[PDB]
């Protein structure tokens, strides 16, 4: 099962089992917007796209963004009949929690309020964050989509079997795949696929089935439906061209691949879902 090498600090198979059980304990519903019957999937795509932009401005990690997306989608699936006017508050509160979890120096509440441009106050965000955390039962430690890409890349590029914890993958392959994942995640249909299979499918579209299998342990039967779902998204990414690694002020250049970026993806999402 384990694509991982032998580990000194743990059993490889056990570490990999623990990770797969997590995926099953954290449950996602591609149909959760049927509980909010007057909301459209485009509303979620705009909200998440907006959160990526906030992330890029505050040099937040991709991990912080994907944590917020998971909290958003799992919180909404616990609730019913949420009015479209509260999505910004739920989104920004999700990101507030995600930032306090993942960031060393997270932005202050005043900045999360500032980006909402009047709509959401600090008090509204403090109220909402508690509402979210109690609804989720404080289950705030998922393996995100991007956490799976981090580990697949490490396995692909592993040189030192004594340094499996020290990252040793190239930066441009990582951000190219993350760009495809950032596009897919704007479509709520993505939630039908486990987050490890989404990571694996986006890697396969930039790779081979030889590599996908090597880094992930999945077989073709496992990712087939996801891979096929993901094709219009891959195609659109290929035709628009991939983005170059950015430098971020105050971010080490060997750490810059971990910073969430943002392009005009709602145009790509239209193009993609056309097909």
């Amino acid at each position: 099962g384990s694509p991982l090498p032998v580990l000194s600090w743990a059993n490889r198979e056990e570490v990999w089992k623990i990770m797969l059980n997590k995926e099953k304990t954290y449950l996602r519903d591609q149909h959760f917007l049927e509980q909010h019957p007057l909301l459209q999937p485009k509303m979620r795509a705009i909200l998440l796209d907006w959160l990526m932009e906030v992330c890029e401005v505050y040099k937040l990690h991709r991990e912080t963004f994907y944590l917020a997306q998971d909290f958003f989608d799992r919180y909404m699936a616990t609730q019913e009949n949420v009015v479209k006017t509260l999505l910004q508050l739920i989104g920004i509160s999700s990101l507030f929690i995600a930032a306090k979890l993942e960031e060393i120096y997270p932005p202050k509440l005043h900045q999360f309020a500032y980006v909402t441009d009047g709509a959401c106050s600090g008090d509204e965000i403090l109220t909402m964050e508690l509402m979210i955390m109690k609804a989720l039962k404080w289950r705030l430690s998922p393996l995100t989509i991007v956490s799976w890409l981090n580990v697949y890349m490490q396995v692909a590029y592993l040189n030192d079997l004594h340094e499996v914890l020290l990252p040793q993958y190239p930066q441009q392959i990582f951000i190219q795949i993350a760009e495809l994942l950032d596009l897919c995640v704007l479509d709520v249909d993505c939630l039908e696929f486990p987050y490890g299979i989404l990571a694996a499918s986006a890697l396969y579209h930039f790779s081979s089935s030889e590599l996908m299998q090597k880094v992930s342990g999945y077989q073709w039967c496992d990712i087939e439906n996801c891979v096929k779902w993901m094709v219009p998204f891959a195609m659109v990414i290929r035709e628009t061209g991939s983005s170059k690694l950015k430098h971020f002020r105050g971010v080490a250049d060997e750490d810059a691949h971990n910073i969430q970026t943002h392009r005009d993806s709602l145009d790509l999402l239209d193009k993609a879902r056309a097909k």
Binding site: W9, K22, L130, W138, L140, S147, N150, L165, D255
Partner: protein, 287 residues
């Protein structure tokens, strides 16, 4: 609320810990209280981390979170109660109350707890005797996960100058960009020695005093003992060049195989440092 707040045990990494009792059950609990009215940024990062970790981290040698209660501008973490912590036990007792067999069973349990954490991709980053809770049956549990972090594989750069100074690993003192689960193993070696000697192994006053106490006993590290050590942010050629003191003289009452374990726990080079899993297979624990 539904608790007779017997008393205040003390203060954690965050909040205040109280001993209390349930009225309905009569059961003894610990209460870590947060004042949400005094928190400009809402629930503290440390609290969100501890709650989220301990919801999914369950093991005989890890303290149990029983409930999280939100009543007013107050948030209460309800924990199983334990009667002693290792710091207060060691400050209240003779050496005879910490025999060689109880040190062995305490250390074994600590490694099982830490090993479970590392396999669940968690680093405590604050292992010290005050955070080690002991019951009357002979169990020891890790507590206070407010300074802990779930790590990724592979891991990124995280907060620096973590871990209480006395139990802090030298790769953190030399300002290394990446630290791993090995920092938790340094602390354990420091606690192991402290249990046998009844006093702290490295009682430093500063980061540089801390680093000199370590060098005095283990020797000043070189590219030969610790490859890359010279390329570390806070390394200086200006450092004195002490040499290894014999461990037989620090911990004479400790058996041969146990002095081998302590030497392996307290390796300078975090890459050459034993893991919790390997440590549990050590001959020390097979008589």
């Amino acid at each position: 609320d539904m608790f007779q707040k017997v008393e205040k045990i003390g203060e954690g990494t965050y909040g205040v810990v109280y001993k209390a009792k349930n009225r309905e059950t009569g059961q003894l609990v610990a209460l870590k209280k947060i004042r949400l009215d005094l928190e400009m940024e809402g629930v503290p990062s440390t609290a969100i981390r501890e709650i989220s970790l301990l919801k999914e981290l369950k093991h005989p040698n890890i303290v149990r979170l029983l409930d999280v209660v939100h009543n007013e501008r107050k948030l209460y973490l309800v924990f199983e109660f334990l009667s002693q912590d290792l710091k207060k036990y060691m400050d209240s007792t003779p050496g005879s109350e910490l025999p060689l067999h109880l040190i062995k069973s305490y250390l074994f349990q600590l490694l099982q707890g830490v090993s479970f954490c590392h396999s669940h991709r968690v680093i405590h980053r604050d292992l010290k005797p005050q955070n080690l809770l002991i019951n009357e049956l002979g169990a020891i549990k890790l507590a206070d996960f407010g300074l802990a972090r779930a790590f990724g594989v592979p891991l990124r750069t995280y907060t620096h100058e973590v871990v209480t100074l006395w139990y802090r690993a030298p790769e953190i003192l030399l300002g290394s960009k990446f630290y791993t689960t090995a920092v938790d193993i340094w602390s354990i070696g420091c606690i192991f020695a402290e249990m046998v000697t009844r006093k702290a192994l490295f009682p430093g006053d500063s980061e540089i005093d801390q680093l000199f106490r370590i060098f005095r006993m283990l020797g000043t590290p070189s590219e030969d003992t610790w490859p890359g050590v010279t390329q570390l942010p806070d390394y200086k050629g200006s450092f004195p060049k002490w040499t290894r003191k014999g461990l037989e003289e620090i911990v004479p009452n400790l058996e041969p195989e146990g002095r081998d374990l302590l030497m392996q726990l307290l390796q300078y080079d975090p890459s050459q440092r034993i893991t919790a899993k390997t440590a549990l297979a050590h001959p020390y624990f097979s008589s």
